[PDB]
């Protein structure tokens, strides 16, 4: 979506893609690590069911 | 859209409180089970001829 926005600005596809990736890099790790760390208890925990 | 609730924070807090109250009321009235029942219904007839 941000690549589309940068294209709408008129800024080239490669440079738009890299800029959007740079802008959105940190939230990607945010959400990904959030979910991944949230499921750590399931694998480690041992017990009933 | 969101301007409504920004101008009226109390109205959004009231929605949140209503949801919280409904959830707290609902939690203690929910069946608990290990897995959903997947057993087809069955009817048994028993006879005895000693």
């Amino acid at each position: 979506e941000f690549a589309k926005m940068l294209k709408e600005e008129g800024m080239s596809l490669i440079e738009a893609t890299v800029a959007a990736a740079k802008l959105r890099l940190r939230p990607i790790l945010m959400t990904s690590l959030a979910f991944t760390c949230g499921v750590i208890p399931l694998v480690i925990a041992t017990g009933a069911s | 859209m969101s301007q409504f609730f920004i101008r009226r924070p109390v109205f959004a807090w009231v929605i949140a409180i209503f949801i919280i109250i409904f959830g707290l009321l609902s939690i203690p009235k929910l069946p608990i089970a290990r897995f959903p029942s997947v057993a087809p219904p069955q009817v048994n007839i028993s006879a005895t001829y000693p």
């Binding site: 490669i14 890299v18 740079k22 890099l25 940190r26 | 924070p9």
Partner: protein, 43 residues
């Protein structure tokens, strides 16, 4: 709007993540250069 007000480990974290952002931009450029090899890899 109601709660939030205008604004050690944190310093190193933010500095390292800014460095990682710059490095990621560089690798992403180099990666975008080579396209056919990664379509092959994805297949």
């Amino acid at each position: 709007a109601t709660i939030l007000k205008p604004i050690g480990f944190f310093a190193w974290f933010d500095r390292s993540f800014d460095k990682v952002t710059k490095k990621y931009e560089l690798m992403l450029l180099k990666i975008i250069k080579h396209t056919v090899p990664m379509m092959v890899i994805f297949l």
